[PDB]
Design a protein around this ligand. Structure first.
Ligand code: SF4
Ligand code: SF4
Lengths: 230, 230
């Protein structure tokens, strides 16, 4: 159940000859679905497999000394979860599903075994890590230079894009995560998150119905997202 | 000039048989020293080599739409600069030396060529990326959950540690970067940066003379760094 995949283009078997493909799936792709709110691993757990998101939504977080969750990323289908566990065979982070999700469990060593063995695989694994790094860098700029109007716009631009790539309307999409969770990730207040979407709707940039977002003006939206100003 | 290196333990030829070692250096390790303020690459440049810091200090940054520098990391000896350029053969970031620095130019393709060829190398390259990701995650928590007292303490804890590993006093070390740059990275004010070091000195935790920092109480310091509170 893995040669079949409409996101393999952005997932892990990207640019594999059909021999590489029929081989990989043999060692992954089969985990009775993860339920909304259940975890894939706890911080401190040993690294065994990495997780490719087949369907659904997953957040990554930690807990502060004083006990608050802080979200470090949301994951969409095609995303790989577990990279930060490679350095030390161990998960520093939590991961939890936000909705019923399908997840492909890829055994790290076995994948590592087959990567030295596979140039196009090895290379693909690389840029995937490269890209998480790139993303995290963008997050850092978001939290230093962008104000709340911008942070949210950026966040919403990002999702919209990513859904586009995973073959969806760039126009319309639901927030699977809660407003609480969005505010967490973005250093904003559920109070503020809401207020902003108001303004966004007020300008006809955005239409908002429950958890469903509609973008009526990508150009406006990108201007706010790409600002980084005060 | 590369089998000789008192930081190879944390640099790139970590866990290489002496055949792997004598081989690698042949393709790197020789760039007439980078001067304080000169750049290694401009955002948008093509990926050719990655850069291992042999000596000195290097910052990574971008420029906002409205034209402000934002620093995404400081690099010490042993650190590899360029990972975020792998996804798309291209540097999204700038890199600039903060003091006269020695830099080992490692050709990416050639290094990639020899990595599929080398299990222990490939694996080492992995965790290095894994670790940048991990670091960036910590930065994200710093910018969301930590206040200024904590941000600085954290930052200073981090440097102190990293100098320790690179074989130095954990006790005492200079800030090579400017207070401006520290404040940039940390979302703080040169006004605030200074005030804090005052308090830090006031409590005898820290002794501060010009650019030189002395930690008299690592335990205090780590408590503030590891807080993430308000
Ligand atoms: S989501 Fe699962 S089945 Fe699809 S390409 Fe990724 S690992 Fe394979
Ligand atoms: S700093 Fe330069 S010489 Fe030293 S191990 Fe790294 S690449 Fe080799």
């Amino acid at each position: 159940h893995c040669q079949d995949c409409s996101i393999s283009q952005l997932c892990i078997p990207f640019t594999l000859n059909d021999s590489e493909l029929d081989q990989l799936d043999e060692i992954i792709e089969r985990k009775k679905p993860i339920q909304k709110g259940q975890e894939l691993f706890k911080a401190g757990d040993e690294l065994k497999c990495l997780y490719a998101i087949r369907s659904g939504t997953i957040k990554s977080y930690t807990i502060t000394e004083q006990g608050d969750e802080q979200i470090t990323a949301f994951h969409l289908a095609g995303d790989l979860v577990g990279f930060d566990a490679i350095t030390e065979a161990q998960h520093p982070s939590f991961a939890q599903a936000l909705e019923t999700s399908m997840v492909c469990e890829i055994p790290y060593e076995i994948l590592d075994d087959l990567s030295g063995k596979m140039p196009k695989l090895r290379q693909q694994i690389m840029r995937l890590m490269s890209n998480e790094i790139k993303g995290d860098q963008e997050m850092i700029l978001l939290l230093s230079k962008k104000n709340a109007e911008e942070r949210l716009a950026a966040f919403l631009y990002n999702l919209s894009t990513r859904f586009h790539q995973r073959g969806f309307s760039p126009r319309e999409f639901r927030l699977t995560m809660t407003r609480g969770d969005i505010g967490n990730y973005l250093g904003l207040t559920v109070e503020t998150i809401s207020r902003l979407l108001g303004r966004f709707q007020k300008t006809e940039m955005l239409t908002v119905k429950g958890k469903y977002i509609t973008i009526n003006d990508h150009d406006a939206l990108a201007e706010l997202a790409g600002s980084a100003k005060e």
